[model samples]
Target: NPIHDRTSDYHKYLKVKQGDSDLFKLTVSDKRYIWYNPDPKERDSYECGEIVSETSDSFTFKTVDGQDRQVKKDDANQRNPIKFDGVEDMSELSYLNEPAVFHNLRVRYNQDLIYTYSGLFLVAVNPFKRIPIYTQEMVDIFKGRRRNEVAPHIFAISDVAYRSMLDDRQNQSLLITGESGAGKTENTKKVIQYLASVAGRNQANGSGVLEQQILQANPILEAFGNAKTTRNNNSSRFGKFIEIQFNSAGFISGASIQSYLLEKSRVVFQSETERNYHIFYQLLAGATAEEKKALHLAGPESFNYLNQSGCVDIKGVSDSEEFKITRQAMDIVGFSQEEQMSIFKIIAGILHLGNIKFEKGAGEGAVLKDKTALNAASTVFGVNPSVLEKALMEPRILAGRDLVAQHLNVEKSSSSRDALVKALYGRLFLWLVKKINNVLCQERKAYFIGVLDISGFEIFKVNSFEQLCINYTNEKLQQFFNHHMFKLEQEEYLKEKINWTFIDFGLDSQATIDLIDGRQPPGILALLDEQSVFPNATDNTLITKLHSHFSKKNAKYEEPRFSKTEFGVTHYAGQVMYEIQDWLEKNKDPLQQDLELCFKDSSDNVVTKLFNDPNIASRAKKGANFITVAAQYKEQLASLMATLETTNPHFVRCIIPNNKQLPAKLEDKVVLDQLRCNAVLEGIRITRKGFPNRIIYADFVKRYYLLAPNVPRDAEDSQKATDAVLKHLNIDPEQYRFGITKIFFRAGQLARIEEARE
Candidate 1:
């Protein structure tokens, strides 16, 4: 029976769990160990001591020399004897070969502990609250030391990548991926932050301007590209790849951001709880009393665009302060005040355009509800009000060389309005990204370390064409992941003459990738683009074309059971049902020729030059030829994938503990699904199959040559000497192998060898 020690008698030295003399229960051994409390200051703390004796109500502990103390079982700081399951290095576990055991250890380590290592993979759990783990002192500790010498951290991962790049002269990429709200963005920021601190040309104030600009780009990018969502406060609605440039000396020379697929439609609509992009609220909340009237801005509620989702402000954030910070960032990124005003004017014009309502007109023509709204919008756009209204109500179209006037009904007018705003906002965002590139990009380039912060697999309630695009991008990335994680591993092993057998690791994403991006008939994106040229093409017709091409043959493609216009494709993750409603118009992305012409010679030179760019003509020629949004994305994705294959890839898979986003509370199924979805288990299993770790003979000799003193260094070749060293160290012969030029070991085997040598 356990005795309750409610008294404060054990406060001096120690406490114990059970009062028993049984040596087995007490764990008395050649080197005795005990679990004891040292003081009242320690919370649930215990340290190793030697067991002395036991009583019915009290157990005694002895120091190495002579001190002995007793404490009751019911002391607040006591527990049953703890096992060695929480070893810092998982490679040291007794059951290291078991997958279940490995997963359990990682899960245990990541619950309260944030990071752990699985051979080359680093696993980080999202700690919702900020910890002091990333301080300067901590960075110093991880720097210049081997990964095994320090506790597992993201800093350790960065250090390894940096050291490997410097040592081998190979380009590196840190592929940071996780589901939304899993803290990928924060992790990405930390990685580049560490690299900047250590690798910047001048860590002092004068010459680090380029590095500072790279750091400052995030806020300006976030203001235009991020938004408040149900999952995260500042959720990134687009994909980005930030490449940090490193010169020959490994200094931060320059950087560039290549952005993809901005959520332009979010400018017009948002969910009830969610808000539009941050710039809208920031402009409204921060516009000066004089500046507000100049840009036609009022309170957020006064504008139909800003008031739609009913979110006027973010909690705990002053939009005015954010506005100041964004302006400063833009200045740092080399945007002049004149250029900034042009951007602001475009934003204000988009809001004013949203307020222009349409009503049924005489016959089929649409009439503006209030002409004053058009005049106000025209003021922001610096265009002719009459031309702006006529552009929507009666635009000229070349019908067989006869310039015929076209009249729009209410629905057509509303769509035209929405399309105009989407076009304006989208073009402005792209232009902003271009200006940013002008300032940060450099001519004489060196190696680069690119960080990809793309959205993970998205399964939403109303999956539309935009959602399809996001998910399709994810599919492409997953294929790259599979190629990097599984295919490349096998190819490298075969190339290196390592003993390896082929294993079909269940998930293969190639078919789905080809299904969406291929050039064959029934190609969804091409067919959609093909149907885009037809004026009367409906979503049903697009669906019909897809069916004629893919329905009979491709196992990955299937038509929706209920909706003839909807289709389903089986992705590597799971089957996603996409509703094709408005997909044709969404894909068409049709811009009004008259409206575009209105900005061709505007008062703002930036707007005029943007309208007159050569890309528009190329886009027009391509639009006249064969092109669509689907094809455009495929081309962009192909370019990104090509770059990825060239770089040496490293992965950091972040896991979100709980939907509640609380600390120390991990939802079992939620996390397990992420692991499976990310193919982490499959990665581990495949890594175990082949020799995933290797060391060149010279490096091996430098570290472990001391173990075999009987074997003279010059007497034997490297492989024979390595063999003798392993045998002398009593390493299991089956745990490792000898390749043609290097010593190869199974996953965790090299670490074991290193531990033994140490």
Candidate 2:
């Protein structure tokens, strides 16, 4: 009873048992392999194309008077539908191909794998893998063919539950969940990729090259938003929300963000080993010398958060070059000169702030008298040295008539003045992030938002309450994934307008907000406020408390029985922990703490910090919250969420890192496996609907395997070397299911055989 072989011989159920009627019975392989003569076209054996049309429970496929036929994936299996009926106890994928053949299977929509337990399996296919018509005639079948369209194999299948979701009174959604580095980003990309490419827009415009703004937006987003993160070598530091807007015509309309949330701490700092996202490096390297100077930034190596990531120039990839591309993309996306300047000034400010040093001796807090660092920063930011220093120490800014940043300070430092500068600048970076996103979104009236990134979940060694909040956000997102995929959201939406307009397929938008921003006094935001309000709250203490809210039976953190924790198969994990939040909330080194926190709240943060000095304890007494969310309370949270969902939404994943040209395991295997397994389980639970699938896509090849074709005996070439053969045959690698490619399998006349190796 091996799990991989879960679908045995076969099983049958009422075609309309639940709701499926247009879709009748399903056919599949026997429990085990057995060789037999099977005229699939005749519908004798368990053939594919049988236009199943019947009632009761089972099905039928005979054109009695004569001409019975079947429907199949491979064109070779095509024939008239209503013919053929005989018996064959066995079915085989191919003849003497390879034992790993079992590892490969083909499944398609309309036909899900129905086996022993009435369970289904999602098939994994790569469009890049070369299929052997085995001989010359076979190789020609792929002649000038688009693998995505020609092949019919699917990597995974949504369950019958999804069908129910379609019938519900809402937008039916499909949530694909999995861990970082396990193909979430790539798979998410592929989904939007396929939907955009194939969702059948009424007008021709959708398929055409997107407008200059759209085409250029991707690079800009990548340069500004993504990074070479540790969890996912190419990770998006910020979470995004992308909503595609469709007019009544069903043509691709406009898109907008429902919300977004970025791991702001990762902006200026990262763990010792894990690198920050690519944008940081790209901007530093790609900026013009003037731009760099304007921002007080040099190359990536100059920054503590950036240097740890490989600083060497990789062929076809360079952070600096990427930055150039970023600038060009930004220009194309309509970012104004003023806007661009604003972005750099903040970054430059951060870098200059990084240069300021403080000794941690004698005082409980820090004291600042040094004028040297202040002068250097002043020169870089083009502000009078004293004024710039003032900006960091006290800046004027208020949220709803209340001053923010009045009491900001640099923690554990030699000079309170320098520390304050760091805090303002640190907060400034966060402000700029929101500013950029806001301006970018406002560029268009309304449009489709194609998010092209993924920031993965993290597990920092030191825990805290903020980490708990971030993790909790991840949990809610995972739950949204649950409703999207397994809930009755999708199918129900179809009923609203059958012609396929903006079928707001499932994503419980409001419900999601309720969960996060519930009216209760003790929701996540409230919890965060307490820590931010309490000076004594370290990440360690905070994380412990956070776990109690959502943990079930957590021995480490006195979990509540009826709380949000997973009591069943669902695992309510570190979502409530904070010790690890510090990794994500990372700031500049202890030495650079001042710079990191200098402008963390607002662009005007400098004016405020330099002006007033307050403490978390007093802020509560004064009845004000110092968190500067661009001065738009509801909008800030909403925007952050939409962006967050887009940037790091749920997806099924499979990771195969590029081990040079070989696909060997990384010492990272254990963690990688953990990511995949946990993400998948979490997906099933929160979603409460499961599709037995694991996503694999080009990132696997580009990240690992490098897409080089092997000339192994198992992958014998057809005249030219493998890749050459593919090139000669005019095969497009991107469409194949091998890397999320799809296809049909039928060794027509080949007999199944078994052989043992020594």
- Please report, in order, the local distance difference test score of every candidate based on alpha carbons: 0.69, 0.37
TM-score of each: 0.79, 0.51
Task: Give me the displacement of residue 520 in model 2, in angstroms.
Answer: 7.7
lDDT of 1 by residue, 1-758 (tens): 01134232221111122345532344332332445556546433334466556566776777544667666656412221234344334433322323333344344545445676654566777777766666665565567667666556778788888888888898888877777778788889899888877786674533477877888888988888888887788888887888888888888888888888888878888888788888988888877889888876767887778787857687767888899999998898788798888888888888888888788868887888678667877887778887878888787887777988789888888888888888777777778777777788889768888888886676777678877776777787666666666665565556445655566645566778667767765467777777877778887777878878888688999977667666788876788887877878877677778878876767776676567785632253442654677667778888887888888878787778778767766664566566656655445555554443432234454443444254454545655655555556556546555556544444342322332222
Each candidate: RMSD: 11.1, 18.0
> What C-alpha root-mean-square deviation, in Å, does candidate 1 show against the real structure?
11.1
Q: Report the number of the highest-TM-score candidate.
A: 1
The candidate scoring highest on lDDT is 1
- What's the lDDT for residue 719 in model 1? 56
Model 2 Cα lDDT, one tens digit per residue, 1-758: 11122232211110111223221233322222211114534322322223344344333344434455432223222221111111010112222111111112211111222110101112121222223212322222333333222222111111121222223322223333333444444444544443343333436534443434434555655554455444545655454445443333333444443224455455455655456555556666666667665545555566544565454343345577666777786676566777666555545555555556543324342334666545655554445565445454545454578765433345533244434434444444344334444433443332232432333344555444334444445555555555445434344324323212233435433332343345563543445445554434665555455566634432333443553321111223433323334321322112232232332233442333432334211122334643422123344444555654443222333333332222222223342334343344333222122111212221222221223243222333222223432333334532222321222122222122111110
Sliding window of 10 residues with minimal summed lDDT for model 2: 81-90
